[PDB]
Design a protein around this ligand. Structure first.
Ligand code: CLA
Ligand code: CLA
Ligand code: CLA
Ligand code: CLA
Ligand code: CLA
Ligand code: CLA
Ligand code: CLA
Ligand SMILES: CCCCCCCCCCCCCCCCCC(=O)OC[C@H](CO[C@@H]1O[C@H](CO)[C@H](O)[C@H](O)[C@H]1O)OC(=O)CCCCCCCCCCCCCCCCC
Ligand code: KC1
Ligand SMILES: CC1=C(C#C/C(C)=C/C=C/C(C)=C/C=C/C=C(C)/C=C/C=C(C)/C=C/[C@@]23O[C@]2(C)C[C@@H](O)CC3(C)C)C(C)(C)C[C@H](O)C1
Ligand SMILES: CC1=C(/C=C/C(C)=C/C=C/C(C)=C/C=C/C=C(C)/C=C/C=C(C)/C=C/C2=C(C)CCCC2(C)C)C(C)(C)CCC1
Lengths: 177, 98, 185, 50, 168, 125
């Protein structure tokens, strides 16, 4: 009967920037009010980019720890030293160049979306594969992407911290604490 | 534009207008200050979840206009020229070819 | 009469008027034999901060109520493990010094308490009125009638005030004695 | 507001009418809007032949 | 200044002093009864405290637990309170007297005003009405002095390790 | 009397602080405080918040208001105002409170040496 109360934090009203967006109006989690201080479109873009980066990085860490390697003796290093070894090897610089060109295109997308020159949704790059045709299907698919991205972000955080703390491959089950 | 729904009211009706908003935020008092950098300071009447962005408003057009200023143009060109000279010196030191 | 934060929040903010009551008509003053409006230093005369002060009083009482129960239970049971055994940390008070910093236990408690506080901080400053001060929607056993709601509100405050004072003795008596739960010499 | 066929997340480049790649209009940076695109076509053709 | 309290007046080369250079009276006028009551009770105890430290050095009470040497003013407290001891005998006595003050002024000390403060009613020596004014100022002037005196006694005696009347 | 100085809530500014402001501010400026004068902010807010007006503020707006009002200690008291009103009177009357330079500064000697000579416009008299 009063404020549109946030579902996540029941004692804090939902921020108006969370209306009509993916995720958002199912949980409305924003107690610190970051959406009240920054554009919701930019926050959503950053969230989706972080989710995708983490979903790739978590699986990369899993594959590297479990023993999957490229057929080169230069890659016979642990996942912890993989970054430094490959930075000194060269491929990290090339990966950075390629991610740089892709991020130049992403920056153009953001600039042309925030200025309204295009009609782009925050995280949309045009890729429409396995995307439901029905609008509710699209909304719930975007929901699934967001949930998986957030889960992978937290999971990769834990994986990196535990791997550094205990020299051990991904499952960390044995360990000692 | 950014206050499409604020129920913005004038000082003369500080305690008269009560219709809150499309949200439930109470009406906000608009004070017309004479500063050009802050032409209007908005004052609240109660607790509200108002979206006030702290980010600036920049656009590609005037950022490019700033980079088109003679300082930026003649600094980028001279920086590239100096860097090219330094790179040539690294790659062909001591002008042995001469 | 416990308006839900959903609507109660519509009358929140720094009130610029005076109710005319002791502390803007807030619970905690009614004593046994009558009223015991206490404030002798006149902190409640700064009526703009009365919702804030009540929030601080409830927050302190809630921490102290757990904290006093904190110094009691380790003296009779401890978490199953060697780091918390009665031989590694004999008395309860030598726990902030033992389990802290690089150890991990206290540091994690600091972080997650920080996360909760940084999330529930907008309720302390915004959305905090003389009506919804300390109310975090967790009303399960709250009575429905107005007068009984006042008793439970009075019950929490008196218990919170008591624990605040009781915890002060608890650490002071324990530190000067190094003894189990009854901190008498 | 149409989008380019090549990069669908970017606005369709104006001044790129049908010359060759009119089906996959590809100018993210926007040199055609900054320069005389006839000169750009001449440079591209000379580069391709060379 | 501070109701009709006699802290000022008859106070030295000037007739009236009125020393309140923080405004603890004007800022909190409802507590002038409490402040006098506290100021007087502080003076009386301090005067008994100073006259205390000296007399044990000559006579000792017949309690036969206090009848022991080496109980100076730096160890008598922590020594007598036992596993109870003499210190509880004193504390219980102070409870008996302090309970009487409650009866005269009510439980919440509601009857405490700016004229009955520090007036337990023990009138044997005083006479007339102006002498009571003169004696009340003589009380405080002695009382305030001993409050600073015992303060210097306790600090100097235990810091410099004096423990006896010179306290030096 | 002046409209906005009546029934002003204590929460906006305290009574003693407001009286100190009114004393420090010259009388002619009460009706229309100039600008950048604490009284200007008092007018610009007391005409918005009060008994018949908006009785509530956001916490941040009230916080900023409390940092625009005087904090009861940055205002000259009556004796200081007398010091200024009399020092300026001495200086304009042609008399100088005699002072003597010292270690990077001057000690006031508590003497009124009549400064202007018999020819008040003469520089060497
Ligand atoms: C890079 C990290 C990152 C970023 C930028 C975002 C961004 C966002 N999240 Mg989010 N989230 C993340 C990680 C992140 N998330 C992770 C790891 C989880 C799992 C716990 C979640 C779980 C989550 C929920 C459950 C919800 C959001 C929501 C939101 C949106 C509003 C919240 C806000 O004001 O900004 C958040 C700003 C930050 C987190 C910055 C980090 C602050 C520190 C310094 C916004 C688009 C809400 C939404 O969908 O509404 C649009 C919502 O209900 N998030
Ligand atoms: C969905 C995410 C997720 C999941 C399933 C787990 C699950 C687990 N964590 Mg973990 N963790 C996470 C996120 C997560 N954590 C994050 C975000 C951090 C901070 C970067 C950590 C930091 C962390 C530490 C430091 C440790 C664990 C440990 C553990 C294990 C106990 C358990 C398997 C412990 C473990 O595996 O023991 C060796 C342990 O020591 N976690
Ligand atoms: C037209 C002029 C010019 C040219 C042809 C180059 C060319 C080169 N520079 Mg160089 N540079 C230049 C100007 C130039 N630079 C200027 C003006 C600066 C500013 C100080 C630099 C600072 C710089 C650094 C710090 C480094 C290079 C490096 C390099 C080499 C690798 C490419 C690279 O990192 O891009 C250079 C990046 C830019 C020019 C962008 C600057 C923003 C390459 C030969 C790298 C190298 O030696 O590779 C092993 C390297 O570490 N350059
Ligand atoms: C003697 C202990 C005591 C008592 C009587 C209360 C009483 C109350 N608390 Mg409370 N609280 C306490 C300890 C206590 N609290 C502690 C230690 C914490 C910290 C975890 C909290 C944290 C807390 C929150 C976060 C909230 C309350 C709220 C409430 C009120 C409604 C809930 C209710 O009636 O159930 C409590 C009744 C019981 C019988 C439970 C006692 C269990 C032992 C009520 C006045 C809510 C409120 O203010 O709503 C009006 C609310 O949002 N409390
Ligand atoms: C704790 C001891 C104590 C207490 C409660 C008081 C209380 C009082 N004194 Mg007092 N006084 C004291 C010690 C004390 N005095 C000492 C040691 C001296 C000697 C320097 C004086 C010298 C003195 C003079 C000369 C006068 C008073 C006066 C007063 C009364 C009004 C001023 C006031 O509000 O003071 C309350 C002050 C406090 C509670 C501060 C306590 C110490 C803080 C915490 C530091 C009040 C009843 C005046 C009076 O009676 O008016 C007629 C007056 O003229 N006093
Ligand atoms: C520890 C020492 C001590 C002692 C020996 C006493 C002794 C007494 N108190 Mg007392 N009292 C004490 C500490 C003490 N009190 C404390 C710490 C307080 C709180 C400040 C009070 C507050 C108090 C009140 C309010 C009353 C008494 C009363 C009494 C008398 C009732 C007799 C009784 O019930 O006996 C068994 C008795 C003389 C009553 C009395 O006689 O006053 C009219 C009374 O009404 N007491
Ligand atoms: C009537 C009050 C009074 C008097 C006459 C003295 C007198 C003296 N003090 Mg003293 N003092 C006083 C109050 C007083 N004190 C109080 C209230 C304190 C508490 C801060 C002290 C703390 C104090 C210290 C810490 C010292 C003195 C010392 C001295 C002596 C120099 C001298 C005998 C000095 C000394 O050694 O005494 C011989 C010294 O070091 N005084
Ligand atoms: C590497 C640089 C990365 C830092 C910049 C990344 C964020 C840039 C913000 C962005 O592009 O959108 C922010 C702005 C869009 O900003 C738009 O501006 C409009 C002006 O009419 C209105 O204010 C719109 O509300 C606002 O969204 O985009 C720019 O053009 C950024 C130019 C590049 C800045 C460098
Ligand atoms: C250095 C510390 C110090 C001591 C130790 C001290 C002591 C006493 N002062 Mg004193 N005093 C200052 C400092 C000290 N005074 C200062 C800085 C000032 C300037 C503001 C000042 C002014 C006055 C005035 C105006 C009066 C006064 C009083 C007394 C008094 C009471 C004696 C008696 O009445 O029993 C005693 C014992 C009254 C008076 O009687 O002086 C004889 C009174 O009228 N004082
Ligand atoms: C972190 C840390 C530690 C710690 C700690 C902590 C948290 C210590 C905390 C200490 C704490 C919390 C101390 C409170 C005191 C409160 C008091 C004294 C209140 C008195 C109040 C009094 C005396 C008066 C009360 C009343 O007047 C009132 C108000 C109204 C009247 O009607 C009734 C009466 C007269 C009764 C260790 C464990 C110690 C060591 C470790 O290594 C480092
Ligand atoms: C960072 C910073 C800072 C610092 C700064 C500085 C200190 C700077 C400097 C700078 C510099 C100081 C630089 C330099 C440079 C140099 C150069 C760049 C050189 C060049 C040269 C040339 C170019 C040459 C050429 C030639 C040749 C070789 C041959 C031919 C001829 C000629 C001669 C032409 C500060 C803290 C303040 C602040 C913050 C920021």
């Amino acid at each position: 009967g009063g404020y549109k109360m946030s579902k996540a934090v029941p004692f804090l009203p939902m921020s108006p920037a969370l209306e009509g967006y993916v995720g958002a109006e199912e949980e409305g989690f924003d107690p610190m009010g970051f959406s009240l201080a920054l554009d919701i479109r930019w926050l959503r873009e950053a969230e989706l980019k972080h989710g995708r980066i983490c979903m790739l990085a978590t699986v990369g860490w899993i594959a590297t720890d479990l023993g999957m390697r490229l057929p080169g003796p230069a890659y016979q290093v642990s996942t912890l030293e993989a970054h430094d070894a490959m930075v000194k090897f060269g491929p990290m610089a090339q990966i950075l160049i390629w991610l740089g060109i892709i991020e130049v295109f992403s920056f153009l997308a953001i600039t042309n979306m925030m200025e309204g020159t295009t009609d782009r949704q925050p995280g949309d790059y045009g890729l429409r594969r396995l995307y439901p045709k029905d609008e509710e299907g699209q909304y719930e698919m975007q929901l699934k992407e967001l949930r998986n991205g957030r889960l992978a972000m937290l999971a990769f955080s834990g994986i990196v911290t535990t791997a550094v703390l205990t020299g051990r491959t991904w499952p960390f089950x044995x360990x000692x604490x | 534009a950014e206050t499409e729904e604020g129920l913005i009211i004038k000082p003369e009706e500080a305690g008269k207008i009560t219709s809150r908003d499309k949200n439930n935020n109470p009406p906000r008092i608009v004070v017309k200050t004479n500063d050009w950098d802050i032409p209007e300071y908005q004052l609240s009447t109660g607790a509200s979840n108002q979206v006030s962005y702290i980010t600036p408003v920049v656009e590609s057009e005037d950022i490019k206009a700033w980079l088109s200023l003679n300082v930026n143009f003649f600094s980028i060109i001279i920086l590239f020229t100096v860097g090219g000279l330094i790179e040539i010196q690294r790659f062909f030191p001591d002008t042995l070819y001469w | 009469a416990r308006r839900e934060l959903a609507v109660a929040y519509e009358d929140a903010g720094i009130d610029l008027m005076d109710n005319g009551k002791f502390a803007q008509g807030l619970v905690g003053a009614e004593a046994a034999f009558g009223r015991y409006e206490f404030d002798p230093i006149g902190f409640s005369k700064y009526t703009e901060l009365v919702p804030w002060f009540r929030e601080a009083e409830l927050k302190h009482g809630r921490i102290a109520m757990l904290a006093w129960l904190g110094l009691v239970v380790p003296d009779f049971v401890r978490i199953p493990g060697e780091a918390y055994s009665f031989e590694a940390v004999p008395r309860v008070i030598d726990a902030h010094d033992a389990l802290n910093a690089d150890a991990g236990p206290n540091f994690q408690i600091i972080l997650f308490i920080s996360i909760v506080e940084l999330c529930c901080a907008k309720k302390v400053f915004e959305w905090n009125s003389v009506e919804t001060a300390g109310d975090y929607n967790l009303t399960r056993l709250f009575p429905e009638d107005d007068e009984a709601q006042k008793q439970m509100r009075i019950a929490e405050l008196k218990n919170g005030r008591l624990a605040m004072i009781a915890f002060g003795g608890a650490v002071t008596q324990a530190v000067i004695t190094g003894k189990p739960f009854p901190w008498t010499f | 507001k149409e989008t380019s066929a090549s990069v669908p997340f970017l606005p369709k480049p104006k001044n790129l009418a049908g010359w060759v790649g009119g089906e996959t209009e590809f100018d993210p940076i926007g040199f055609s809007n900054w320069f005389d695109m006839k000169w750009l076509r001449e440079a591209e053709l000379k580069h391709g032949r060379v | 200044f501070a109701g009709g309290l006699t802290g000022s007046d008859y106070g030295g080369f000037g007739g009236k002093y009125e020393w309140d250079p923080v405004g603890f009276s004007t800022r909190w006028p409802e507590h002038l009864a409490w402040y006098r009551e506290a100021e007087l009770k502080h003076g009386r105890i301090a005067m008994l405290a100073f006259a205390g430290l000296l007399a044990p050095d000559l006579f000792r009470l017949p309690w036969a637990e206090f009848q022991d040497s080496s109980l100076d003013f730096a160890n008598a407290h922590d020594k007598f309170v036992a596993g109870f001891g003499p210190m509880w005998w004193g504390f219980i006595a102070c409870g008996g007297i302090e309970y009487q003050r409650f009866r005269k002024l009510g439980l919440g000390m509601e009857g405490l005003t700016l004229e009955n403060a520090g007036n337990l009613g023990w009138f044997d020596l005083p006479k007339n009405s102006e002498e009571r004014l003169f004696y009340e100022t003589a009380e405080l002037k002695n009382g305030r002095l001993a409050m600073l005196a015992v303060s210097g006694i306790f600090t100097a005696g235990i810091f410099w390790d004096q423990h006896h009347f010179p306290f030096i | 009397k002046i409209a906005y100085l009546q029934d002003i809530p204590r929460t906006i500014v305290e009574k003693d602080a407001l009286e100190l402001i009114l004393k420090n501010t010259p009388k002619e400026q009460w009706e229309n405080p100039p600008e950048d004068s604490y009284l200007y902010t008092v007018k610009a807010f007391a005409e918005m918040y009060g008994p018949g007006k908006a009785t509530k503020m956001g916490w941040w707006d009230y916080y900023r208001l409390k940092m625009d009002m005087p904090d009861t200690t940055r205002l000259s008291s009556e004796r200081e105002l007398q010091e200024i009103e009399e020092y300026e009177k001495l200086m304009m009357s042609g008399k100088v409170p005699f002072a003597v330079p010292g270690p990077s500064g001057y000690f006031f000697t508590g003497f009124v040496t009549q400064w202007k000579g018999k020819e008040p416009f003469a520089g060497d008299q």
